[PDB]
Amino acid sequence: MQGKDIILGILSKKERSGYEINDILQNQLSYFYDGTYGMIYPTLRKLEKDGKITKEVVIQDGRPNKNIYAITESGKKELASYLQSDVNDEIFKSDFLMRLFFGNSLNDDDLEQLIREEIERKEEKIKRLSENLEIWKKKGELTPTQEITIKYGLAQYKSTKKVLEEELAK
Amino acid sequence: MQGKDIILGILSKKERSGYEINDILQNQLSYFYDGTYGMIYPTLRKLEKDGKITKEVVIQDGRPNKNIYAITESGKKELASYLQSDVNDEIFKSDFLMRLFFGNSLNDDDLEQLIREEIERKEEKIKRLSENLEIWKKKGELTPTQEITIKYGLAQYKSTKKVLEEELAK
Incomplete structure (x- = not known):
């Protein structure tokens, strides 16, 4: 079971900022997925490279940039496939x-x-x-x-x- | 907590063959350490390289080589430090x-x-x-x-x- 799969799960229903994805993973879903620190950012980078999600950088005056992530068609396909797969230990x-x-x-x-x-x-x-x-x-x-x-x-x-x-x- | 920490724990008390370390890891400690397979052998290689254990290859007529591993002084020191460290999530x-x-x-x-x-x-x-x-x-x-x-x-x-x-x- 990989970080990529739970992230696609999180992004299945909504476009979400990195902040929000992290909030969900750290604070909401940690009772069934609690891994090592700093999984989320490299995994988001790879999902984007592999065309499974898109990343939008939102710029605002006097604020840090905010990254908004959205699942793609292929990303939805990958999630669907994963949920059809045999359960991992x-x-x-x-x-x-x-x-x-x-x-x-x-x-x-x-x-x-x-x-x-x-x-x-x-x-x-x-x-x-x-x-x-x-x-x-x-x-x-x-x-x-x-x-x-x-x-x-x-x-x-x-x-x-x-x-x-x-x-x-x- | 890394694979190397539990293997040092396994080797703290006794010299053990690779077979025995694997038996302990897979069939005795799996209730608190059940990770991705393929950890043990690369981990033993790194521990030896870093001088934390020794590897002895016992050759016998008509049998596969038996590998026997033993903790070194530096290994015992590394384990002691680990067990003194703050508990990880x-x-x-x-x-x-x-x-x-x-x-x-x-x-x-x-x-x-x-x-x-x-x-x-x-x-x-x-x-x-x-x-x-x-x-x-x-x-x-x-x-x-x-x-x-x-x-x-x-x-x-x-x-x-x-x-x-x-x-x-x-």
Whole structure:
């Protein structure tokens, strides 16, 4: 699963500025796509080169330039093809879990802190996903399949947060 | 978190053959590190080049060469530094969720199919992780922090499986 595919997805229904695409990817869709920093800009560049999207540079007095991206016919074709494709294995790499797995030396304080910091991360993600669920629902935009993904995401966050809470409780 | 960090983790305690490192990576640690295949061999080459591990080629009559890898002092230092570093954000990319999120066109059949297949994938991951838990425990090799990671992994698989089962039930 590539950044290019989720970006075409984001651009399927609307022309969007880079700001808006980044907002969607970082703040809305991160419960199912959270990769490495700085994927978006090189990937937008390649999608443009490959003719899957267009880029418009909007100039305004006294403001930074704004880039507006729009899917092309070929881009829509590529998205449609991708959604017809066999599902790829999920990718999951948890640094937190790695630290605990290889955490023989961790003293009690260091371990306790790692657990608390991860609990806070889960709380932040739950809050954000919960807030988007509410807004999407309020706006009448949430589709039934989207609803499933949110229920899935929340369950994921809450179940693992609970494990850590239960650990801290002893 | 990079492939090189987990491989150093694997090599911290024991010298291991490439076969064994791969077995650990693919069949033991996949619950917190499941990335794009084809990482291990290029990563071992780079680690050796950078002096963080050694490679020993054991030649035997009538068998393929066996490669044995061992962490070096500089390697141990690199691992120590890594484990002291701030925890990185988890990477999580679900093609399954992406399909449902952008799955406006899915007919009831194709949707149900995707869900059933994702349930199966989760059942398998649960089996593998549960199996390793029991083995490690009986062997006396399961550390307290490792057990936390396993409980965390199982909760994540079971809670999301549960959401999908309840969806199919409706």
